[PDB]
């Protein structure tokens, strides 16, 4: 829910680095393993930035999703 809110948050300018740091804090510090809703909420936010590094992050996240035994669906291709 926090990444879904940060995907549409336009109150401040730092929604994308806050989402990146929140994903890193969830994976590395909290010890949670990201499932399909985490990957979808992160890729939907990374697909909005036309910078090539964020697009590369979205492609690497989709490749890690398909490598970890999570097949692509209509939301992933979207």
């Amino acid at each position: 829910l926090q990444l879904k809110a940060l995907a549409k948050d336009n109150s401040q300018l730092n929604s994308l680095p806050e989402a990146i740091q929140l994903f890193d804090q969830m994976e590395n510090v909290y010890g949670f393993i990201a499932s399909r809703p985490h990957y979808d909420a992160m890729m939907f936010h990374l697909s909005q930035s036309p910078r090539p590094e964020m697009r590369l992050r979205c492609e690497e996240l989709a490749h890690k999703m398909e490598l970890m035994g999570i097949v692509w669906n209509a939301n992933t291709y979207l």
Binding site: S11, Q12, L13, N14, P17, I20, Q21
Partner: protein, 242 residues
């Protein structure tokens, strides 16, 4: 050399027509395997020190080798320093050059220098690297700052707590340890969760980035029914001239 592997034609050689001529010492095996065909920038060599050292192999055999400290660097942000001993001068220079390429590092030249004071110390040598708009250091430190590309920087080295303050490797070692410990603005902004331009520039909506995220129904005054979005009242979204 940017072509370590590729199509090896039979009728053609491995070198090209418009090739930069090598030196008397420059061999292609100086750059190691993990960095071969990776650097897109040319490097320039600067010698820190030559020295003569008595090397003991046997109790009845003592040779006099040459010990060389240097650093390689490019003004586009990548530099490394090395030191090695060898029986001759050119072999010491080659081994110190491959040591410098083995221990190469890089920094961010977005602001052409640091953006916060970095006070670091090795055993005895205490070096501060502070932001500036000029390059303010002595020539031996200004050459390393030009080797890193830090034109807007200042550096100060205190060697009083060292056992041998006249050692020439202490200066280059302290400068490389201080530049290695420096974080860029984009790295700090990514670690905090901020945009980097909100950390260095004086524009007023960046003050919105300072405070924590609070709800827009909570900051704005409520209505007759309860909490209300500020864009749902007509008098806020409509301009006064209409």
């Amino acid at each position: 050399d940017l072509y370590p592997e590729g199509f090896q034609w039979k009728h053609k050689l491995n070198t090209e027509y418009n090739q930069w001529r090598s030196n008397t010492w420059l061999t292609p095996d100086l750059i190691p395997k993990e960095h071969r065909g990776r650097f897109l920038c040319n490097f320039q060599l600067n010698i820190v020190a030559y020295d003569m050292r008595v090397v003991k192999f046997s109790p009845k055999d003592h040779r006099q080798w040459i010990y060389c400290v240097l650093y390689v660097g490019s003004g586009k942000g990548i530099a490394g320093w090395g030191r090695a001993v060898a029986p001759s001068t050119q072999e010491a220079k080659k081994e110190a050059i491959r040591e410098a390429f083995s221990n190469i590092i890089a920094v961010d030249l977005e602001q052409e220098g640091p953006m916060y004071p970095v006070r670091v110390n090795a055993d005895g040598v205490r070096v501060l690297l502070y932001p500036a708009r000029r390059i303010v250091a002595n020539f031996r430190v200004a050459d390393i700052l030009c080797a890193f590309g830090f034109q807007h920087a200042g550096c100060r080295i205190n060697l009083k707590a060292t056992n041998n303050p006249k050692s020439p490797t202490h200066t280059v070692e302290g400068v490389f340890e201080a530049v290695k410990a420096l974080r860029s603005v984009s790295e700090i902004a990514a670690s905090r969760g901020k945009v980097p331009h909100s950390l260095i520039y004086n524009i007023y909506p960046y003050l919105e980035e300072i405070r924590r995220r609070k709800g827009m129904m909570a900051m704005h005054p409520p209505g007759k029914d309860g909490l209300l979005m500020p864009d749902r009242v007509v008098d806020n979204r409509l301009p006064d001239h209409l």
